[PDB]
């Protein structure tokens, strides 16, 4: 698995830490990059994306993403999704019009000649570019920039959508969240009893619940059994996802989910090589589709994903202006409380987001 092996790579590199990235967005930038890559550099990228038998249609691959981008970029109401890619290339590097054209046309991405000789100027231009493309949601992508950089590739994505059903601000109270058995933090816990797509996975030992967004996206929160986080991570795979997308049944639940913001920032040139994509970062890189200039390669491939989660939804919890019972108070339903590290997916027909919430 491209996506899940990448998740494990990132996880292994930063134990006991939050992880968060966009799979679709990463595949998108790699395909886009293959547009100017040649020989073994290109082939490593395509196989990494996993590319059909007969090494068939790359243009079909670009068609898919091309359409996907369009659908993703079409506004709704209270749906905030900013995603994009850009290539910053040194002044020496003469660009190929066929590359620049394909990038803008197919992926809506830009290629900007840049003066990396002025490290501090380039960093600010890049950060300002992203701050604007994100309507201010991602303001300081790069934290440092080398003077010898030749080409910087940045991929960014910010997402915030209204729940299909809201969380009553009256159900939010501070509560303990156990990062570990001995590390505890107070967090504002939202709550709402309702019918949710539930799933008990005895194989991996974890509970999965689905919460739909006011649109076409649905959040999946995975709660491992006490001490089973590593096991679950070891079990993550596209197959498993398919499996889960079937076991899903409606179940009355009193859900307790934290209000939180989560982000991941990565230098993919330090992890992708372990997944088989290495030539593109070396001096032996083949980016002849991009320029005829020798000695060029991707100096840095940064990726930043940001997502905010809160009460806001489309409609308020309609009800029990029907609560019938002789009891003083109705009894509780099954309770699912995320007050220990959990995993989270945000999926449409693809996987927009994948991460591990260790500390809200």
Alpha-carbon gap, residue 215 to 349, rounded angstroms: 12
Please, which experimental method was used? X-ray
Alpha-carbon gap, residue 124 to 139, rounded angstroms: 10
Range of the domain at 3: 1-162+258-311
Alpha-carbon gap, residue 9 to 14, rounded angstroms: 9
Q: In whole angstroms, how large is the CA radius of gyration of the chain?
A: 22
Residues 121 and 215 in one domain: no
Residues 79 and 158 in one domain: yes
Alpha-carbon gap, residue 292 to 94, rounded angstroms: 7
Alpha-carbon gap, residue 178 to 223, rounded angstroms: 13
Token pair recorded at residue 343:
């995993």
Contact between 359 and 18 under an 8 Å Cβ cutoff? The reply is yes
Closest CA to 187 of 254, 253, 264, 256: 256
Residues 158 and 134 in one domain: yes
Residues 199 and 332 in one domain: yes
Residues 218 and 337 in one domain: yes
Residues 321 and 304 in one domain: no
The CATH number assigned to the domain holding 12 equals 3.30.497.10
Token pair recorded at residue 218:
């649905």
Burial of 225 (0-12, 13-18, 19+ CB in 10 A): middle
Token pair recorded at residue 27:
């595949």
The CATH number assigned to the domain holding 225 equals 2.30.39.10
What does 134-167 look like in DSSP terms, one character per residue?
TTTS-----S---TT--EEEEEEEEEE--EEE--
- Max CA separation in the chain (angstroms): 82
Token pair recorded at residue 250:
């409606």
Q: Which one of 274, 296, 311 terminates a domain?
A: 311
Token pair recorded at residue 134:
């994100």
Closest CA to 267 of 235, 302, 242, 295: 302
Contact between 220 and 210 under an 8 Å Cβ cutoff? The reply is yes
Residues 44 and 172 in one domain: no
Q: How many separate domains does the chain show? A: 2
Alpha-carbon gap, residue 52 to 84, rounded angstroms: 26
Alpha-carbon gap, residue 176 to 197, rounded angstroms: 25
Residues 113 and 39 in one domain: yes
Helix then strand then coil, in percent of the chain rounded to 5, is 30, 35, 40
Residue written as token pair 């910010």: 158
Residues 112 and 231 in one domain: no
Residues 154 and 240 in one domain: no
Alpha-carbon gap, residue 209 to 223, rounded angstroms: 9
DSSP E strand boundaries for the chain? 19-21, 80-90, 110-114, 151-160, 163-165, 173-178, 184-201, 206-212, 218-224, 249-258, 260-267, 300-309, 313-315, 334-337, 342-347, 351-357
Residue written as token pair 């790359």: 58
Q: What contacts 185, CB < 8 A, 6 or more positions away?
A: 176, 177, 179, 359, 360
At CA 33, angle to CA 8 and CA 90, rounded to 5? 115
Contact between 35 and 97 under an 8 Å Cβ cutoff? The reply is no
The number of C-alpha atoms within 13 Å of 72 and in the hemisphere containing its C-beta is 24
Residues 18 and 135 in one domain: yes
Contact between 93 and 295 under an 8 Å Cβ cutoff? The reply is no
Residues 286 and 151 in one domain: yes
Residue written as token pair 């491209």: 2
**Run of H or E including 231:** helix 229-235
Q: What contacts 47, CB < 8 A, 6 or more positions away?
A: 276
Alpha-carbon gap, residue 199 to 210, rounded angstroms: 9
């Amino acid at each position: 698995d491209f996506t899940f092996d990448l998740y494990r790579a990132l996880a292994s590199a930063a134990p006991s830490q939050n992880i968060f990235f966009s799979p679709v967005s990463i595949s998108m930038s790699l395909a886009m990059l293959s547009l100017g890559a040649g020989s073994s550099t290109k082939m490593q990228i395509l196989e990494g994306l996993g590319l059909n038998l007969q090494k068939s249609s790359e243009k079909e691959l670009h068609r898919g993403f091309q359409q996907l981008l369009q659908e993703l970029n079409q506004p709704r109401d209270g749906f905030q999704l900013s995603l994009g890619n850009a290539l910053f290339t040194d002044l020496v590097v003469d660009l190929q019009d066929t590359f620049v054209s394909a990038m803008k046309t197919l992926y809506l991405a830009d290629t900007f000649p840049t003066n990396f000789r002025d490290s501090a100027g380039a960093m600010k231009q890049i950060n300002d570019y992203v701050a604007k493309q994100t309507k201010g949601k991602i303001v300081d992508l790069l934290k440092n920039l080398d003077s010898n950089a030749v080409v910087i590739m940045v991929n960014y994505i910010f997402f915030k959508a209204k729940w299909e059903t809201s969380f009553n601000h009256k159900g939010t109270q501070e509560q303990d969240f156990y990062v570990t058995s001995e590390t505890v933090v107070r967090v504002p816990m939202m709550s709402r009893e309702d019918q949710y797509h539930y799933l008990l996975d005895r194989n991996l030992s974890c509970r999965v619940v689905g919460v739909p967004y006011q649109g076409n996206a649905t959040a999946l929160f995975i709660l491992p059994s006490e001490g089973k986080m590593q096991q679950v991570e070891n079990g993550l795979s596209e197959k498993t996802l398919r499996k889960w997308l079937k076991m899903f049944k409606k179940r009355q639940l009193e859900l307790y989910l934290p209000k939180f913001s989560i982000e991941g920032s990565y230098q993919l040139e330090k992890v992708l090589p372990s997944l088989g994509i290495s030539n593109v970062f070396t001096s032996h890189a083949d980016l002849s589709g991009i320029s005829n200039h020798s000695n060029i390669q991707v100096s840095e491939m940064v990726h930043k994903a940001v997502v905010e989660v809160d009460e806001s939804g489309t409609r308020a919890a309609a009800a029990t202006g029907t609560i019938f019972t002789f009891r003083s108070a109705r009894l509780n339903s099954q309770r699912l409380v995320f007050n220990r590290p959990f995993l989270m997916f945000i999926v449409d027909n693809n996987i927009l987001f994948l991460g591990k919430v260790n500390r809200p």
